[PDB]
RNA sequence: UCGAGGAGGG
DNA sequence: AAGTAGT
DNA sequence: ACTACTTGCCCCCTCAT
């Protein structure tokens, strides 16, 4: 804290290494000889032997006798201990042994030379650690230190190499000792540490630099400890819980152990030394030095304190969630924080936070005294710390700090410029507000303080959704920035209105919720009319009101305003919304849809689809059009008019809202009756062996799959029966229609019927023997036995329904609990794996190594928040409707621009050069239609893109009062060249070379296809009716909003991608039946070697879509089967006459297939099973015969003989040869199909595909699904489409088709995991993750085995997992840390090179005088 | 090296000011204004140092240069006066 | 039965002509779409049995391939009739390679090249030899949906790539040398491949990977 | 003022 | 225990 | 094929050096 004249710098590089004993003895300030910590007279001095002998203070006296500084300074000074004998460093016994196996003993020389080939190529590995792995692999088995070697010129006359003669021992680890054997019996000698030390000290400098070591920073000899550093007290501080008692740290005691064992070894060495007696006091010194650094050694007793609990090792301090790195550096407890219960408030602005007075009196901001505030600050100092607008402390330039609670001068402080005043938090201070867990960045947002009473944080309700905050008792956190520039970082980056439209889903993340949403529908109703007395209150309630009472829609006998009318006062001007819900006409008979013009509602009931977090909703529009702050006011003004109107209209929900209304119940139970009658039918079916299974499914499985569909297909029927019976006044229906709470299934279960309970997919199992409850007879598969709840929640469950429903509920609660640890840990692995990824100032997306992950972020360079789903109007419809819309033929009197559309209309008829222009326009639009159908194969047209051109043109049509009568003053040169010119101004990259310029046309290609598709000449002139005015204005706006939509270099895209994936992973209430989201995502992120549902989707040859027989042929062509699948039984007979036969049913078919063994093997096959696989006994026998060739004489009955028999005999004394031949036949040999393929189902997928007319048509095709993967083999099968085949095993895709195709399948799978739960995540996040996993050439797991073994800095990698082992290898290998990783600058307390740190701020002296 | 400075007539980054550049400029300035540093605008009654910095930026009277570093130590200097400020 | 096996060999012959055409050698599209009948019409004996040594062929570089890569030598593609390639046919093909003095030699083996023969694979530098299994060649993987356009960059094209992005080769995405497509292009170490794939954010996106 | 164990909250 | 990296 | 492994958000009482 005190001033120092040393130059202040920041850490640029961290150079890791190992301590030479000499350097320890050098920087050692004390010798440390006695375990006595205290003066031994307990005179409150510290002995000149262990604690403060020049090492630092534990008291309040100018100590640190070397520093003369006293604590809060003198960080701690080191001492040394000279060890009586070398001991291993426990963290390197693995590496020491590994080095011991590479070098010869008694000759410090590398075992393998450059005279070896595999060595000299492993020697050239540029990496250090991987080279050491290859050298240790080549040298762990050369055991003879060879002295001469076959040369490179001639293996005959060979070459010497100055080699050791001795044989190299085979070494093994025993506890903490290294023991070896040599070369008629062996010999075993333990390797003394000094022997290894002398051998390491003789390793050549080139050899250990080849072994990854560093001549100056980490020689191999230093993994062995000779002089041991003694950390100062601040690392192992004392305790003062009484006065004449002081508790020393665990480390101080463990050192005293090391010192005791050392003095024992020193006297035993200096005296008469019995060999065994000292060579086990050494084993004890090694034990103490080892367990002092790591006391969690595998396969050893822990070093235990007196009380039995183990001594906390130093490694234990750094490792783990609560260790040094995770819980003290990557995360801290912080000052200037506050936390309390949260509440809602209809009367706070969206970006305000209600702060209780007691907290505002406590939290304090340091304001520098400037002439702009000396008056206000002087008044706050007068109010002092007890009244709210007051202050706690005053800091003078000297430093010593005045406490207004106590200072006698707190009354008459006359402030001075430059002094700091620590004033209370006051209204409109930017503060950071957070609810936990903090899953995405919107969980922490900057609010404006409003000091209020009553001890609760108060939130605006539209901000609940991003925090995931309810008011069932939550607490939220508040952090108060302390610098004038961290406030700016909050108000200009993290402020709530900025975070409204989120880049995670390119949609808003805040909407109109709960009361205001339920009321805005009742208010918006067509027959909702407001009287004058109440209109004036609703108007005065909107603060930005212009004071202009709008003309009432109804004058007539009495003036009446509509609900839509008054609500429109909150919608600002310049807002245009169109949405056709369903059967919506422009007449909107059902008040369906939404039509807002200039900020006035024209028709349509307002609900969730208009004012929720909807994609094209009112909030997304106002935010893009008018701005963050205008949309934030839009929340407050709607939540004030709707909330006020609802306050006086009222709203409730009673139990009568669940009444089924008489006969609807009668008709509901009839519906359940005829359903309970259909299952009893299928039961008598399956009980009489009359039902038949679908392929690859049990008769029983097929039965239950039927029954379940029968049941909950009838539950949904009673559901819609009650939804339809419920009048439009039913308050629950009102909430479902407004979209504020509740859904269909809710009405169904509450009023009609609950439905079938399920556990693990199937119905309620037979927990007891052959029944679900003892109140049931055995083998009872009835609906009301396996857990079908027939009663509504209104009627009431029976004890059986109650218990089954309890079982089903417990499955969901278990699922939640069992999965939260998984989703939370997947979230962490994602963040820690993408954390150092951001966009640099060349638009390339890089990590902390400069390695390019994405050349242009998201392949388009756009901020996901500036992107909306618009339609590509040039991909669908007939080839003709295309021509009708876009073709302009100036040389044809029927297909020319009508002279009504523009003024040069008649004088351009027959213009050959203009037609040459419109021709090349039309050839570009048809080129685009080609390109689009190549990119989007299935014809999907709606795709998220940067500039909403539809709104940008509706704006022009309104701004300029465009009448669909007057002809445009545009010329075709204006439109065609204006758009052609506009494109080369849509800029993302900006380099002056063909690489970057090609990258530009690439990144801009798709958007330009949309632009030309919407600014085509006939569209501009016949649909839009634009003017050269409105058109030029549309072009300038498109260029503006485009440049605004590019990403800003600095966006921490990595963390955004991780949070954008991990947070939807939280909301997954999971679980062909394949592995579902949360487990499958665990599979994918881990690069799971043996996944759970390895399906294979095989599409067949093009000219065979509907050929079902062809599909049946491929099913039989690939689906594996063995003889076991068709064999009923096998028997061994003694039938010793190869020409006669004792079994009379085999009397025939013996003179028909007309030396050997008298022993007969007779198989009986299943006619039904043979027919599922098309029989052909000849194929079976022919395969067996060609399986054994001459050794096995085989005959069989013919393909329709009543019993299906194969007889087998051996050819020219054990007879167990036949016993083993039986299961050789049953298990090993195959009949037809591919290996690892098991079931093969035929499903008939729908598939959109373009008609010869042009438009896309549903043309479904037969597809085979699969249980098991053999891609390399199924691929080469005749009759299939080998270019549409797909596997959910992307590990296989990477191995057969390449890394790129693996990246595409890896994305297709992660996308299926999110979409399967209804969620939407924008492309660039999933894309960025998949690109990180594939950028190194293979599949890098998001796992301590994959990415955390990269070349990123050691501090970054250690901040994840395997912390101390990573820091040990960093020390041994002398790693260098760029401190480019964000985690490094977090550890070092430096501004990280992210966001506002991606650049430096320079002051310019010449502009400093230009301005004065 | 110091051939690390891309010359002005060869700068290829964006001519627009980023969210982070603007936030770091307004913060840095409001910090210096708050530490009694010379102000280059008519205050016109403004007394919050941030609102003062927003006024300096509105008139391009901020005398600071943004040093944009490229992934190799190369960098481009840009004055706040040059940089376009949409938002 | 024996007839269905010869079709697979014909499919691999096709995929070989496609791979040679793609690597940058003068092959026509007629030679590629060599129909089903005309194959047994040329490479089957009296019994209708495929003779494989007849199938081997040389291929020369195209005009623009020599313009882009001047040292793209001539390529030789020998097939083997014996399903296990003995070291005798290897040294025959190998001394053939340096005798006629080629740059690249592609050896398609039916079932197994012995550990003895594959010892002579890097025995003729400065020429390289690639070994392809017959069954991994029946389907051209590059015709798959998920395999986008790979393009081998020249030494100057890559030097320009590293300059215009300020990159060391370590900062470039990597393609494994044993990667199926890298084997398909004869992609050697350090050679940079340029990957043009379609996109849904933009119309088309260009990435690059480097060998190993 | 040292920590460990248990019970709870969203 | 899961699951993988390494002996 | 067997063994060596690491590792699974924020926020009161009781006990005993
Ligand atoms: C602390 C991380 C976290 C929060 C909420 C979650 C909700 C459900 C699940 O399991 C399905 C995971 C969560 C993880
Ligand atoms: Mg809650
Ligand atoms: Zn000191």
């Amino acid at each position: 804290q005190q001033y120092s004249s040393a130059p202040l710098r920041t850490v640029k590089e961290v150079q890791f290494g190992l301590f030479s004993p000499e350097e320890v003895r050098a920087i050692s300030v004390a010798k440390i000889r006695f375990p006595e910590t205290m003066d031994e007279t307990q005179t409150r001095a510290k002995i000149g032997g262990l604690n403060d002998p020049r090492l630092g203070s534990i008291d309040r006296n100018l100590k640190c006798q070397t520093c003369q500084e006293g604590m809060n300074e003198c960080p701690g000074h080191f001492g040394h201990i000279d060890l009586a004998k070398p001991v291993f460093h426990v963290g390197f016994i693995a590496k020491i042994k590994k080095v011991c196996e590479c070098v010869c003993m008694h000759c410090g020389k590398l075992l393998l030379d450059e005279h070896n080939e595999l060595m000299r190529q492993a020697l050239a590995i540029k990496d250090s650690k991987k080279r050491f792995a290859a050298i240790w692999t080549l040298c762990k088995t050369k055991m003879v230190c060879e002295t001469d070697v076959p040369s490179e010129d001639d293996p005959t006359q060979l070459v010497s190499r100055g080699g050791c003669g001795n044989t190299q021992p085979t070494i093994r680890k025993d506890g903490l000792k290294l023991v070896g054997s040599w070369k008629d019996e062996p010999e075993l000698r333990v390797l003394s540490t000094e022997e290894i030390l002398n051998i390491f000290k003789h390793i050549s400098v080139k050899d250990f630099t080849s072994l990854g070591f560093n001549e100056v920073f980490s020689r191999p000899e230093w993994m062995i400890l000779t002089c041991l550093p003694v950390p100062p007290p601040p690392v192992r501080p004392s305790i003062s819980f009484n006065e004449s008692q002081r508790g020393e740290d665990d480390l101080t005691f463990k050192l005293a152990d090391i010192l005791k064992a050392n003095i024992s070894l020193e006297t035993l060495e200096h005296n008469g030394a019995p060999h065994h007696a000292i060579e086990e006091a050494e084993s004890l010194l090694q034990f103490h030095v080892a367990t002092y650094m790591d006391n969690d050694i595998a396969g050893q007793p822990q070093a235990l304190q007196k009380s039995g609990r183990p001594v906390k090792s130093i490694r234990a301090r750094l490792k783990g969630k609560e260790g040094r790195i995770r819980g003290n550096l990557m995360g801290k407890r912080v000052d200037f924080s506050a936390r309390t219960v949260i509440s809602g408030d209809p009367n706070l602005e969206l970006d305000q936070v209600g702060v209780p007075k007691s907290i505002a009196k406590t939290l304090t901001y340091p304001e520098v005294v400037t002439p702009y505030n000396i008056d206000r600050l002087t008044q706050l100092v007068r109010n002092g710390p007890n009244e709210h607008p007051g202050a706690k402390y005053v800091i003078r330039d000297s430093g010593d700090r005045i406490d207004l609670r106590y200072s006698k001068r707190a009354g008459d402080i006359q402030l001075q410029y430059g002094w700091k005043v620590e004033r209370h938090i006051m209204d409109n201070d930017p503060v950071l507000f957070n609810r936990q867990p903090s899953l995405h960045k919107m969980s922490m947002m900057a609010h404006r303080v409003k000091v209020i009473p009553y001890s609760t944080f108060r939130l605006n309700l539209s901000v609940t959704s991003p925090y995931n905050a309810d008011f069932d008792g939550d607490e939220m956190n508040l952090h108060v920035p302390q610098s004038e520039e961290t406030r700016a970082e909050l108000s200009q980056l993290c402020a709530v209105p900025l975070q409204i439209v989120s880049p995670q889903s390119n949609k808003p993340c805040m909407g109109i919720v709960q009361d205001t949403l339920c009321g805005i529908r009742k208010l918006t109703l067509r027959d909702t009319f407001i009287e004058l007395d109440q209109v004036l209150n609703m108007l005065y309630w909107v603060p930005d009101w212009d004071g202009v009472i709008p003309t009432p829609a109804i004058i007539k006998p009495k003036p009446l305003w509509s609900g839509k009318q008054i609500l429109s006062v909150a919608i600002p001007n310049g807002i245009h919304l169109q949405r056709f819900d369903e059967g919506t006409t422009l007449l909107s008979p059902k008040d369906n849809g939404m039509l807002i013009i200039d900020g006035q509602i024209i028709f349509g009931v307002v609900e969730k689809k208009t004012v929720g977090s909807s994609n094209g909703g009112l909030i997304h529009v106002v935010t893009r059009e008018k701005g963050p702050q205008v949309c934030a006011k839009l929340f407050g003004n709607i939540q004030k008019v709707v909330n006020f109107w609802l306050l006086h209209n009222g709203f409730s929900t009673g139990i009568g809202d669940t009444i089924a209304d008489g006969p609807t119940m009668r008709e509901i139970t009839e519906t359940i009756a005829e359903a309970k009658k259909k299952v009893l039918d299928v039961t008598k079916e399956a009980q009489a062996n009359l039902l038949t299974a679908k392929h690859g499914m049990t008769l029983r499985e097929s039965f239950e799959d039927n029954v379940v569909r029968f049941l909950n297909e009838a539950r949904d029927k009673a559901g819609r029966l009650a939804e339809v019976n419920l009048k439009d006044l039913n308050n629950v229906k009102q909430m479902v229609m407004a979209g504020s709470k509740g859904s269909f299934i809710n009405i169904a279960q509450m009023s009609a019927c609950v439905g079938q309970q399920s556990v693990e997919g199937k119905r309620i199992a037979f927990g007891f023997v052959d029944r679900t409850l003892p109140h049931f007879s055995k083998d009872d598969y009835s609906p009301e036995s396996k857990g079908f709840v027939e009663n509504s929640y209104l009627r009431g469950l029976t004890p059986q329904e109650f218990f089954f429903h309890a079982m089903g509920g417990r499955e969901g609660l278990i699922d939640t609990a069992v999965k939260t640890a998984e989703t939370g840990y997947i979230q962490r692995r994602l963040v820690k794996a993408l954390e150092d990824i951001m966009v640099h100032y060349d638009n390339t997306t890089r990590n902390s190594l400069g390695n390019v992950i994405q050349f242009i972020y998201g392949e388009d360079g756009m901020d996901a928040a500036h992107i909306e789903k618009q339609s590509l109007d040039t991909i669908g419809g007939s080839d003709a409707a295309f021509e009708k819309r876009y073709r302009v033929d100036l040389l044809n009197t029927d297909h020319t621009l009508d002279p009504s559309l523009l003024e040069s209309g008649s004088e351009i008829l027959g213009d050959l050069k203009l037609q040459v222009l419109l021709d090349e326009e039309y050839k570009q639009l048809v080129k685009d239609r080609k390109f689009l159908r190549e990119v989007f194969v299935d014809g999907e047209a709606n795709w998220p893109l940067p500039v909403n051109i539809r709104r940008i043109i509706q704006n022009a049509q309104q701004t300029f009062h465009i009448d669909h009568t007057k002809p445009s003053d545009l010329t075709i040169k204006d439109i065609v060249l204006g758009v052609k010119d506009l494109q080369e101004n849509l800029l993302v990259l900006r380099g002056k070379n063909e690489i970057i310029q090609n990258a530009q046309r690439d990144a801009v290609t798709l958007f330009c296809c949309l632009l030309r598709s919407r600014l085509a000449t006939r569209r501009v002139l016949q649909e839009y009716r634009l003017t050269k005015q409105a058109f030029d204005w549309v072009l300038s706006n498109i260029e503006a909003q485009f440049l605004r939509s590019v990403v800003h270099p600095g966006e921490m895209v990595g963390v955004l991608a991780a949070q954008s994936i991990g947070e939807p992973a939280t909301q997954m209430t999971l679980n062909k039946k394949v592995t579902s989201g949360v487990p499958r995502l665990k599979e994918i992120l881990n690069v799971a070697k043996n996944m759970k549902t390895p399906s294979l989707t095989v599409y067949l040859e093009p000219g065979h879509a509907a050929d079902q027989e062809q599909a049946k042929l491929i099913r039989s062509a690939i689906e594996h089967t063995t003889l076991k699948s068709v064999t009923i039984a096998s028997e061994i007979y003694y039938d010793p006459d190869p020409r006669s036969t004792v079994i009379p049913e085999d009397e025939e078919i013996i003179q028909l297939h007309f030396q050997q063994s008298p022993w007969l093997l007779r198989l009986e096959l299943d006619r039904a099973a043979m027919n599922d696989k098309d029989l052909t006994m000849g194929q079976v026998g022919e395969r067996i015969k060609q399986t054994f060739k001459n050794d096995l004489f085989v005959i069989w009955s013919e393909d329709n003989d009543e019993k299906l028999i194969i007889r087998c005999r051996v050819v020219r004394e054990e007879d167990h040869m036949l016993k083993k031949i039986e299961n050789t036949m049953l298990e090993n040999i195959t009949l037809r199909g591919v290996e690892n393929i098991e079931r093969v189902v035929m499903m008939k997928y729908d598939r959109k595909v373009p008609s010869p007319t042009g438009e896309y048509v549903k043309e479904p095709e037969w597809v085979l699904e699969t249980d098991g993967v053999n891609l390399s083999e199924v691929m080469t099968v005749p009759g299939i489409d080998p270019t549409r085949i797909y596997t959910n095993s992307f590990i296989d895709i990477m191995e057969v088709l390449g890394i790129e195709a693996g990246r595409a399948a890896l994305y297709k799978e992660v996308y299926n995991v999110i979409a399967s739960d209804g969620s939407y995540v924008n492309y660039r996040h999933m894309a960025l993750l998949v690109d990180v996993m594939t950028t190194q050439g293979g599949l890098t797991s998001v796992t301590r085995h994959g990415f955390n073994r990269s070349n990123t800095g050691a501090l970054m990698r250690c901040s994840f997992e395997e912390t101390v082992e990573i820091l040990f290898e960093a020390g041994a290998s002398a790693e260098l840390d760029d401190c480019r990783g964000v985690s490094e600058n977090v550890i070092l307390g430096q501004m990280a090179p992210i966001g506002t740190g991606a650049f430096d701020v320079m002051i310019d002296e010449e502009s400093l005088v230009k301005y004065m | 090296l110091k051939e690390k400075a891309i010359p002005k007539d060869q700068r290829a980054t964006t001519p627009y000011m980023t969210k982070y550049e603007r936030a770091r400029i307004l913060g840095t300035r409001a910090l210096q204004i708050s530490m009694n540093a010379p102000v280059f605008v008519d205050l016109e009654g403004e007394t919050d140092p941030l609102r003062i910095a927003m006024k300096e930026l509105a008139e391009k009277k901020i005398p600071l240069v943004i040093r944009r570093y490229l992934p190799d130590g190369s960098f481009e200097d840009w004055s706040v006066e040059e940089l376009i400020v949409d938002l | 039965e024996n007839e269905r096996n010869i079709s697979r060999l014909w499919r691999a012959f096709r995929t070989v002509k496609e791979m040679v055409k793609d690597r940058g050698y003068f092959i026509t599209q007629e030679e590629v779409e060599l129909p089903l009948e005309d194959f047994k019409a040329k490479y089957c004996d009296s019994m209708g049995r495929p003779q494989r040594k007849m199938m081997s062929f040389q291929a020369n570089p195209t005009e623009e391939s020599i313009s882009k890569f001047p040292d793209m030598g001539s390529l030789w593609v020998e097939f083997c009739d014996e399903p296990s390639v003995g070291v005798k046919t290897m040294k025959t093909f190998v001394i053939h390679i340096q005798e006629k003095n080629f740059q690249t030699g592609i050896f398609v083996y039916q079932n197994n090249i012995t550990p003895s023969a594959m010892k002579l694979v890097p025995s003729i530098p400065p020429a390289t030899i690639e070994t392809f299994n017959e069954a991994a060649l029946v389907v051209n993987i590059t015709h798959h949906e998920l395999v986008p356009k790979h393009i081998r960059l020249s030494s100057d094209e890559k030097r320009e790539l590293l300059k215009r992005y300020r990159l060391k080769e370590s900062q470039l995405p990597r393609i494994q040398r044993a990667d199926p497509v890298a084997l398909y292009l004869g992609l050697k170490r350090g050679e940079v491949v340029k990957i043009i794939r379609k996109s849904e954010t933009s119309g088309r996106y260009a990435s690059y990977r480097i060998c190993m």
Side-chain angles (χ1 to χ4, degrees), chain A residues 509-637:
Chain A
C509 74
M510 299 173 212
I512 301 289
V513 191
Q514 288 272 329
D515 272 32
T516 304
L517 177 54
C518 179
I520 200 173
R521 177 201 140 268
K522 292 185 70 81
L523 171 67
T524 303
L525 289 195
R526 204 190 277 281
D527 63 344
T528 286
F529 293 62
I530 297 101
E531 222 153 18
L532 166 67
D533 61 343
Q534 178 145 107
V535 162
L536 307 181
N537 281 324
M538 305 202 201
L539 293 172
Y540 187 45
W541 250 108
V542 201
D544 312 288
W545 182 50
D546 44 342
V548 198
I549 314 164
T551 312
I554 283 190
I555 322 189
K556 329 232 175 88
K558 70 175 309 189
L560 261 51
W561 294 253
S562 93
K564 307 172 198 295
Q565 212 177 345
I566 293 306
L567 174 62
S568 293
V569 189
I571 315 193
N573 304 327
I575 297 292
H576 188 261
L577 197 44
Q578 270 198 52
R579 195 230 320 159
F580 300 99
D581 262 333
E582 191 194 18
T584 38
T585 68
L586 286 75
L587 209 47
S588 195
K590 286 309 178 186
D591 217 15
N592 255 349
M594 201 61 251
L595 170 65
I596 314 190
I597 306 169
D598 202 23
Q600 307 299 105
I601 292 170
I602 306 273
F603 66 72
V605 193
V606 175
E607 96 303 355
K608 197 166 179 185
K609 290 190 249 83
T610 309
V611 300
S613 324
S614 70
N615 219 279
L618 182 62
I619 284 160
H620 198 321
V621 175
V622 181
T623 300
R624 285 277 141 271
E625 287 292 317
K626 287 323 181 205
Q629 325 75 9
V630 192
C631 188
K633 286 179 181 191
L634 179 61
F635 287 97
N637 291 343

Side-chain angles (χ1 to χ4, degrees), chain B residues 23-53:
Chain B
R24 169 102 180 264
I25 295 291
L26 293 184
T28 288
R29 270 311 274 175
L31 189 80
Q32 327 187 301
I33 281 82
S34 92
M35 297 160 67
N36 322 290
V39 179
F40 311 94
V41 192
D42 266 32
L43 289 318
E44 286 190 77
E46 280 311 316
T47 39
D48 170 22
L50 188 69
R51 289 254 278 165
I52 289 169

